Amino acid sequence: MIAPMEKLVLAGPKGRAKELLQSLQQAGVVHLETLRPEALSAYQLSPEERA
Amino acid sequence: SKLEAILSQEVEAEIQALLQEAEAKAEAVKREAEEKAKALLQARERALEAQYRAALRRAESA
């Protein structure tokens, strides 16, 4: 059958978001979504992080 | 929100630490200007004392 596939939205500060990204990568049970448009930034992290 | 108030408080705390450091530097600059003004006033007072001494010496010589 088709599953429910509930949507989840999370927010907070930046370093806690990096830790929660490590968490949700360890707990990889949620597919991602952009949702960039309404009053948000792009989260271009760092060129040092890019390096 | 809770994270909203935490982020606003963190930005205000960073601005307050920067303002306190800049105000400490400005008060140090004011103290240094007061010390330089005190040294200049001491130099002018020693010059006035030497001028009065030389004037009294010239008057006694005449």
Domains of chain B with bracketed CATH: 1-62 (1.20.5.620)
Please tell me the distance from the alpha carbon of residue B4 to that of residue A11, in angstroms, as a whole number: 10
Question: By the 8 A CB rule, do A30 and A8 touch?
Answer: yes
A37 touches chain B (CB under 8 A): no
Question: By the 8 A CB rule, do A38 and B32 touch?
Answer: no
Q: Count CA atoms within 13 Å of residue B8 on its CB side.
A: 5
What angle is formed at CA A34 by the lines to CA A33 and CA A35, rounded to 5 degrees? Answer: 105
With beta carbons under 8 A apart, name residues in chain B contacting A13: 3, 6-7
**Interface contact B7-A13, CB threshold 8 A:** yes
Angstroms from B9 CA to nearest CA on chain A: 12
Neighbours of B25 (CB within 10 A): 10
* Tokens encoding B7: 């982020």
Q: How was this one solved? A: cryo-EM
Resolution (A): 4.3
Please tell me the distance from the alpha carbon of residue A14 to that of residue A45, in angstroms, as a whole number: 10
* Tokens encoding B55: 């004037």
Q: Between chain A and chain B, how many beta carbons pairs sit less than 8 Å apart?
A: 5
Please tell me the distance from the alpha carbon of residue A25 to that of residue A29, in angstroms, as a whole number: 8
Breaks (C-N over 2.5 A) in chain A follow: none
